[PDB]
Design a protein around this ligand. Structure first.
Ligand SMILES: *[C@@H]1O[C@H](CO[C@H]2O[C@@H](C)[C@@H](O)[C@@H](O)[C@@H]2O)[C@@H](O[C@@H]2O[C@H](CO)[C@@H](O[C@@H]3O[C@H](CO[C@H]4O[C@H](CO)[C@@H](O)[C@H](O)[C@@H]4O)[C@@H](O)[C@H](O[C@H]4O[C@H](CO)[C@@H](O)[C@H](O)[C@@H]4O)[C@@H]3O)[C@H](O)[C@H]2NC(C)=O)[C@H](O)[C@H]1NC(C)=O
Ligand SMILES: *[C@@H]1O[C@H](CO)[C@@H](O[C@@H]2O[C@H](CO)[C@@H](O[C@@H]3O[C@H](CO[C@H]4O[C@H](CO)[C@@H](O)[C@H](O)[C@@H]4O)[C@@H](O)[C@H](O[C@H]4O[C@H](CO)[C@@H](O)[C@H](O)[C@@H]4O)[C@@H]3O)[C@H](O)[C@H]2NC(C)=O)[C@H](O)[C@H]1NC(C)=O
Ligand SMILES: *[C@@H]1O[C@H](CO)[C@@H](O[C@@H]2O[C@H](CO)[C@@H](O[C@@H]3O[C@H](CO[C@H]4O[C@H](CO)[C@@H](O)[C@H](O)[C@@H]4O)[C@@H](O)[C@H](O[C@H]4O[C@H](CO)[C@@H](O)[C@H](O)[C@@H]4O)[C@@H]3O)[C@H](O)[C@H]2NC(C)=O)[C@H](O)[C@H]1NC(C)=O
Ligand SMILES: *[C@@H]1O[C@H](CO)[C@@H](O[C@@H]2O[C@H](CO)[C@@H](O[C@@H]3O[C@H](CO[C@H]4O[C@H](CO)[C@@H](O)[C@H](O)[C@@H]4O)[C@@H](O)[C@H](O[C@H]4O[C@H](CO)[C@@H](O)[C@H](O)[C@@H]4O)[C@@H]3O)[C@H](O)[C@H]2NC(C)=O)[C@H](O)[C@H]1NC(C)=O
Ligand SMILES: *[C@@H]1O[C@H](CO)[C@@H](O[C@@H]2O[C@H](CO)[C@@H](O[C@@H]3O[C@H](CO)[C@@H](O)[C@H](O)[C@@H]3O)[C@H](O)[C@H]2NC(C)=O)[C@H](O)[C@H]1NC(C)=O
Ligand SMILES: *[C@@H]1O[C@H](CO)[C@@H](O[C@@H]2O[C@H](CO)[C@@H](O[C@@H]3O[C@H](CO)[C@@H](O)[C@H](O)[C@@H]3O)[C@H](O)[C@H]2NC(C)=O)[C@H](O)[C@H]1NC(C)=O
Ligand SMILES: *[C@@H]1O[C@H](CO[C@H]2O[C@@H](C)[C@@H](O)[C@@H](O)[C@@H]2O)[C@@H](O[C@@H]2O[C@H](CO)[C@@H](O)[C@H](O)[C@H]2NC(C)=O)[C@H](O)[C@H]1NC(C)=O
Ligand SMILES: *[C@@H]1O[C@H](CO[C@H]2O[C@@H](C)[C@@H](O)[C@@H](O)[C@@H]2O)[C@@H](O[C@@H]2O[C@H](CO)[C@@H](O)[C@H](O)[C@H]2NC(C)=O)[C@H](O)[C@H]1NC(C)=O
Ligand SMILES: *[C@@H]1O[C@H](CO)[C@@H](O[C@@H]2O[C@H](CO)[C@@H](O)[C@H](O)[C@H]2NC(C)=O)[C@H](O)[C@H]1NC(C)=O
Ligand SMILES: *[C@@H]1O[C@H](CO)[C@@H](O[C@@H]2O[C@H](CO)[C@@H](O)[C@H](O)[C@H]2NC(C)=O)[C@H](O)[C@H]1NC(C)=O
Ligand SMILES: *[C@@H]1O[C@H](CO)[C@@H](O[C@@H]2O[C@H](CO)[C@@H](O)[C@H](O)[C@H]2NC(C)=O)[C@H](O)[C@H]1NC(C)=O
Ligand SMILES: *[C@@H]1O[C@H](CO)[C@@H](O[C@@H]2O[C@H](CO)[C@@H](O)[C@H](O)[C@H]2NC(C)=O)[C@H](O)[C@H]1NC(C)=O
Ligand SMILES: *[C@@H]1O[C@H](CO[C@H]2O[C@@H](C)[C@@H](O)[C@@H](O)[C@@H]2O)[C@@H](O)[C@H](O)[C@H]1NC(C)=O
Ligand code: NAG
Lengths: 325, 172, 320, 172, 325, 172
């Protein structure tokens, strides 16, 4: 009661710190509760550019991966390239013979994952035909040309003999062979180029085969051409053999691509590539990977935070903040 | 919070305590003072710091995956690709929401616990020599200079030497 | 005793509590709990929030092609098309390679908006018909398809083009007739073997008919095979054929939709609901449901459990 | 429960306590009475109310998905569609089971915590004027009519007023 | 409070908890590592190194794939009318009949595996104007040239092969599986020798489905004396539906059908031995105990199995914090 | 731990306590004794025994599923198959890690709580006849033979019998 503390007493008070400006977090108990400090767990900002300092980034520029593989002339710079990540641009275009690839997406995936365009020519012998067919749809310089990796065969004299060739795989890796069939625009064109009215391509290994027939008919002109080539592929394992048998329309392989089991990929993005430090790439550019989550893009490559829908998640790093007064 | 110390029987925090999370203020014949408690502070910090590392694996490299954007309609295979990705995202988004709420709850509860534990530790040292005033304050019923306060703070307070004096002050 | 008092602290209890599960206990009694799993449906599909189209005796595909008994479905749109298990085809027997994909693409787009186009088919007979496909008790055909046959003793190579000068994608449905015999082939098309090539600048399809008997369906042992082609703005459709073409009459408008299709036999009626399942609409108040893994709309999550009780009150400790 | 108040040092609940989840019963010179405690009640209700909304996102629209029932045998693609769906359902079923068990544990704990807190709050007010009899009851060692009980209820009880009377009754 | 001998009129009562000399470390939300009195391992990381034969019916394929047993490759004759919960395919398995391929092999394998039976019923197909039961030196059964037991290789009779047209209704209450094929001859001479027509064709149909295959004449890699191939296809006929077969050459005909069941069966690739023991969970590494909730042995499992996770260890506390004396 | 009993105000455990998890040691005129407390022990064991089963089913029966290993490169469908499986495995691996961390935290918390609860229960019985000496020990200020200790252990100690004797000893 005495206003002055007796000398034979003391007061001891227990307490905790507080800060003037706390921050709000969510718990199991409370929609919002103020804590002394919190940290952001969601990366929502990108670097606006793709960093090329950790992973080997290859800019496709005007070329798709497939066109670089086939050897579209404007893609010649890409011969024998390799990558961790191949960047495909929305403005890429094809500029050779018009073509399609049944299951295009699978071939793109296989090559992208392999991470290389290491190509090796092989000594195929094509008895009794003319090799190195070319087209005005595909200029290399100012000269009619063709996909560098394919060999467009046509008749010699008045005949196109049944082609029958073999190529054993005596290496220790998978060989990828790319080949095709030409689809003429008319019966007249078919017999003109290949003699046989009904073309056929059979590509086989010991335990698999692909049997293809040409498709004949008028189609919309693309670079002056109503004809088309359809592209196919065949993987030959070590100890297996490749066989090609055709009585017309064959667009022959010139060799093989080396297939690797890689950590490579392909990504669609229009963002510039520059010098900087990042271990995670998205179509929006590289991002920091300090945080466990990100809301930048579900498409990622590298050492990346997990994509989630939320744009912010605040983790408390301090106690409940209870300011004075 | 569940112990009722922080935002509870302790009315508010001290913005003037910058060298610790928990501590003491005292008043005796030598004046008033303040001192941080390092052990309670460290215990809380150790539990809180990088706490997610206990449940979230070190981020690893992922490489080629599935396509997640499509420029043409295709039907069945594309429907499945999109559904798989949507499913994955929804499950990880839920995991993230739950983890943060659980961790935050745990953080609030463990810091409230440290406050209560420091209070109980002090109470036990003092035995019959002090009373709980409320507000997290003790009235100590004997002469208790800065060295004596110091013995409470470092856990070496000997209640026995002050008991006779304290009991007489408390009860007479 | 006037010199003292007693003050007791306590908490409430109820005579009738309820059992829940915790991390600590398989079952513990609390004062109150609530069910989190929706296990009851309305037994009917509510048609008030989403546009529900009852297919009745028609599949979506048959409505698309214009099977005579599906003529009511012309130019319809939906959020959800409902297919009944008793739906049936009643026109020329057909198949569609990748049927499931076409159905999905159309279901998703959510419209059957069709626009006729002025295809010229020089030197052939148009509007072929069949006893397999009766309309008004007379031989007929799919409303959206144009069965071409010889004119006189000729069937010239058809070669037609249709530019897409619009700003949306066109969907073209077309087909090829597989006759049951060489006699029918030459009778209808002159040529001993037909061919249909449908292409654009970025895709081509060439189909050859296969002559022979399939099982009798509505008088017919031949078949039509159905195909589709999407023509983007700026692109052009080309059709080339020397026989057996079942021609398109125009195009369907494709849009980016939030629509779907669902199989169900329950009635459609007026009621309040935002979640549809094959068993009927269900309330969406609860976070979970065990009615059906198939849903459309704003739906609780499907889980295996038929009941999950969330405590809404303290441990219940009744008086003796 | 972890605090050992509900189904613990408090033997049972009160069915006759209708206007609160927690409260008081008392006997003094003026008879017997009962009163609910509003703050403790409100604190528990606020934490329990719509608690799932803190973890589960508001139900959003889903539209076209994958087929989940099949009328033909198909092999590989169908196997994958069924596997994807089963995978999803089993993951959500686990999430549901865990969430409910965790939330229920939290509800049981927080309600036990509120009971304990109210007890401790009351104990601190009474200082040296009362003893814990067990069973959640205090023996108050002075004449304590309804206004005095009321002062405890609203947190304004002044122990110093009664301390001499109480100390004498306790320790004579 | 010294007094060497305690006071008779006081007592001391201490409260405590137990401890063990050798605790074990676990992880919590609060601590990277904390010592507890005991813990239990939740991840099964050890297999029995063999597949147990006693809970589920395990069938060892030995030298045969499930597909070869289905087709009736002679060295697989022992597998006729077999049934299984789990069919085990060994990596040493081989084919020893006419070389063949199955487009979508994986799907057919899955369908048969799941059904869990090779129950086969012959049917009275009438093959007018052709020779039945073709044999090959590529497919010896004992000392005789033979063929897949479940297929019927048709060739010309006299100097004619008429257009075959056969039917078979399904009046049962289950789905019938028909396996059938087409021969791709290696040469034109062989084509006309066997089938007269210069080009054959097979159309197999039901009320609601149809498949047409045209052969492709040409060389594939020599396998067991043959540069030709058979391609295998299947048709599932539902109750009330009807099988129709149409061919003017190259048909490798079904002899009947396999009963399809809605089963709980599967097939697994493993090279570990099968033996007497009791277990309810099988992996390619062998049977595993299923007492634990998780396992890190193999993502491929069958039966009552712990869930596969990436961690090789997870310790669950079964006791309090251990605070040794 | 949050209650600060185990590895807290109780300095260490007792390796010589073999027939219970919690218990009492005592010294009086008759000598020294030890006795397990069975109720606190059982409570802890019941909560810990097969606790995972409250949230996860032991093992689930599964039959035919998708392929998970591949001998050929195939592209799109195979990419999807691999992605689905990897997605599932990462999600379950996360579930396993979190569950074990949460359950271990709960086990530590509940065992610490049982220790605290037994101490508080004993404190409540003793009323004014004993003081908490720290370390989890009570000094009982009266003659307290084995039968008396027994009455504490079975919850029948009547503080009133001994109060005058204890008060005289406490305040001298
Ligand atoms: C609080 O009080 C609740 C109300 O029940 C009571 O109603 C009042 C007015 C009085 O008349 C009481 O005498 C009467 O019992 C208690 O709820 C009841 O709890 C029991 C379990 O303890 C439930 O039993 C289950 O019944 C199922 C029957 O199907 C339906 O039938 C009733 C109508 O009679 C419906 O309302 C229900 O919703 C049911 O859907 C049955 O399927 C179950 O069988 C299974 O389990 C048993 C073992 O328990 C086993 O033998 C058997 O093989 C099955 O595996 C089960 O028997 C009862 O449904 C339920 N009644 C209501 C209306 O909810 C409640 O227990 C009580 N709470 C506490 C803590 O005591
Ligand atoms: C089936 O039907 C289709 C569709 O009608 C026919 O395909 C057309 O075939 C003709 C040639 O026979 C093509 O016509 C040629 O087009 C060339 C390219 O056009 C450019 O310029 C126009 C602007 O007017 C743009 O539309 C376009 O983008 C191009 O930039 C022209 O270079 C040609 O002109 C020159 O050709 C003649 C000879 O034909 C020369 O003597 C002259 O120098 C002349 O200037 C020509 O007009 C047309 O492109 C094709 N259309 C399509 C969509 O493919 C098939 O021929 C038909 N099949 C059968 C069997 O009858
Ligand atoms: C290849 O081989 C197949 C298989 O044999 C042949 O296909 C059969 O061809 C015949 C001839 O067209 C078909 O016969 C028809 O069957 C119809 C369906 O029968 C069902 O419904 C009737 C109800 O009327 C029941 O009686 C019966 O139990 C069945 O449930 C009948 O409706 C037809 O009868 C009508 O037409 C005849 C015309 O002769 C009239 O006389 C009758 O009055 C009646 O109006 C008719 O008999 C048979 O359906 C085909 N079977 C299959 C499985 O397709 C191919 O012909 C053959 N191909 C070649 C080139 O030879
Ligand atoms: C298209 O092109 C391909 C590739 O050249 C041709 O296919 C080859 O055709 C020949 C002729 O049939 C095949 O020759 C056969 O080879 C077998 C070899 O297998 C292994 O074992 C022998 C040891 O005997 C080794 O020499 C060899 O390296 C292999 O390791 C032989 O078994 C056969 O040889 C002889 O067997 C009998 C004994 O029973 C002898 O009496 C005969 O002399 C017989 O010749 C046989 O010669 C060769 O295998 C094919 N290669 C491939 C890769 O398929 C096509 O023929 C060609 N097509 C056309 C239409 O021209
Ligand atoms: C026992 O627990 C249940 C928890 O489900 C309690 O029922 C819930 O009570 C609240 C408040 O009355 C209801 O919310 C109200 O909803 C209406 C319209 O939907 C709205 O206008 C009000 O403003 C209010 O939000 C809630 O719907 C209801 N939930 C259920 C499933 O019935 C119940 O009150 C508890 N009983 C006791 C005694 O505490
Ligand atoms: C939801 O479904 C209900 C029920 O199916 C729809 O109401 C029904 O609509 C039909 C046809 O549109 C109505 O038929 C009409 O009725 C008069 C006489 O009643 C008839 O002479 C007319 O020729 C006309 O066809 C019918 O009355 C009505 N049925 C019922 C049972 O209510 C409703 O349109 C649907 N709502 C929405 C928003 O889609
Ligand atoms: C806190 O309570 C005291 C005690 O007495 C009251 O108890 C209350 C819970 C209430 O039910 C009331 O009816 C009862 O009187 C209050 O003191 C009393 O206040 C009333 C007016 O509200 C006066 O009439 C009395 O004279 C007065 N008596 C004494 C001894 O103080 C007090 O006002 C109340 N204060 C607050 C801030 O809530
Ligand atoms: C609680 O214990 C008391 C006394 O102490 C007992 O402690 C027990 C654990 C046991 O070891 C026992 O041998 C020991 O006596 C019990 O009261 C006593 O019971 C005995 C025989 O029933 C009588 O001879 C004593 O006079 C009596 N003491 C008193 C003061 O009545 C008591 O039975 C026990 N209560 C319960 C409910 O278990
Ligand atoms: C990263 O790039 C993507 C791709 O455009 C952006 O995602 C789009 O966001 C816009 C604006 O909200 C929407 O119109 C689209 O629906 C999104 N997707 C696509 C495929 O267009 C994303 O916002 C970008 N993030 C940045 C720049 O930080
Ligand atoms: C909704 O309807 C489905 C069928 O679409 C029901 O699922 C069946 O349930 C029964 C038992 O009630 C099982 O025997 C069948 O095997 C199930 N069929 C299928 C195809 O899954 C389901 O019960 C209904 N749900 C309700 C009414 O809540
Ligand atoms: C400590 O925990 C272990 C489990 O980690 C227990 O030992 C197991 O006991 C079970 C059932 O009796 C046996 O199937 C296992 O073979 C044992 N495993 C191991 C690794 O030893 C043990 O019971 C516990 N020990 C104590 C003293 O409680
Ligand atoms: C698993 O399968 C069965 C029992 O389920 C057993 O096979 C028989 O036992 C021995 C193998 O040691 C053979 O001599 C018999 O011929 C088998 N029986 C028949 C009918 O063939 C065997 O115990 C288990 N293991 C193996 C490898 O078969
Ligand atoms: C324990 O405290 C004793 C009291 O005096 C000191 O308290 C310290 C905490 C510090 O603030 C000093 O300035 C005080 O003078 C002291 O004599 C003992 O040495 C202390 N022992 C230890 C180990 O801290
Ligand atoms: C603990 O492990 C030691 C090995 O260091 C061994 O001697 C004994 O088995 C255990 N000790 C005790 C006291 O049980």
């Amino acid at each position: 009661q005495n206003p002055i503390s007796n000398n034979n007493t003391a007061t001891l008070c227990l307490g905790h710190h507080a800060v003037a400006n706390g921050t709000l977090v969510k718990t199991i108990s409370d929609d919002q509760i103020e804590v002394t400090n919190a940290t952001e767990l969601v990366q929502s900002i990108s670097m606006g550019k793709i960093c090329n300092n950790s992973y080997r980034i290859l800019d496709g520029r005007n070329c798709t991966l497939i066109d670089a593989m086939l050897g579209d002339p404007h893609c010649d710079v890409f011969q024998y390239e390799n990558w961790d990540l191949f960047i495909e641009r929305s403005s890429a275009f094809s500029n050779c013979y018009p073509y399609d690839i049944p299951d295009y997406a699978s071939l793109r995936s296989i090559v992208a994952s392999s991470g290389t365009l290491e190509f090796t020519a092989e000594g195929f012998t094509w008895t009794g035909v003319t090799q190195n067919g070319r087209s005005g749809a595909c200029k290399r310089g100012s000269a009619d040309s063709f996909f560098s990796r394919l060999n467009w065969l046509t008749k010699s004299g008045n005949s196109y003999p049944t082609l029958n060739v073999t190529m054993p795989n005596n290496k220790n890796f998978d060989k990828l062979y790319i080949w095709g069939i030409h689809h003429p625009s008319s019966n007249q064109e078919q017999t003109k180029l290949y003699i046989q009215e009904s073309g056929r391509v059979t590509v086989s290994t010991k335990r698999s085969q692909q049997t293809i027939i040409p498709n004949i008919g008028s189609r919309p002109w693309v670079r002056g051409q109503s004809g088309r080539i359809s592209i196919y592929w065949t993987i030959v394992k070590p100890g297996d053999i490749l066989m090609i048998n055709s009585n017309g329309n064959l667009v022959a392989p010139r060799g093989y691509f080396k297939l690797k089991t890689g950590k490579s990929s392909v990504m669609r993005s229009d963002v510039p590539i520059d010098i900087c430090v990042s271990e995670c790439i998205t179509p929006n550019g590289s991002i920091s990977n300090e945080k466990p989550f990100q809301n930048v893009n579900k498409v990622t490559y590298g050492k990346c935070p997990k994509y989630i829908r939320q744009n912010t998640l605040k983790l408390a790093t301090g106690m409940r903040n209870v300011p004075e007064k | 919070g569940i112990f009722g110390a922080i935002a509870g029987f302790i009315e508010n925090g001290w913005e003037g305590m910058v060298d610790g999370w928990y501590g003491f203020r005292y008043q005796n014949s030598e004046g008033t003072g303040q001192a941080a408690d390092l052990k309670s502070t460290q215990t809380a910090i150790d539990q809180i710091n990088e706490k997610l590392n206990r449940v979230i694996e070190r981020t690893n490299e992922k490489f080629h995956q599935i396509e997640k954007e499509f420029s043409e309609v295709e039907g069945r295979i594309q429907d499945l690709e999109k559904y798989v990705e949507d499913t994955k995202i929804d499950l990880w988004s839920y995991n993230a929401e739950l983890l943060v709420a659980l961790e935050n709850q745990h953080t609030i509860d463990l810091t409230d616990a440290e406050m209560n534990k420091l209070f109980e530790k002090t109470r036990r040292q003092l035995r019959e020599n002090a009373e709980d005033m409320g507000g997290g304050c003790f009235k100590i019923y004997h002469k208790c200079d800065n060295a004596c306060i110091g013995s409470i703070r470092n856990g070496t307070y000997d209640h026995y030497i002050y008991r006779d004096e304290a009991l007489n002050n408390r009860f007479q």
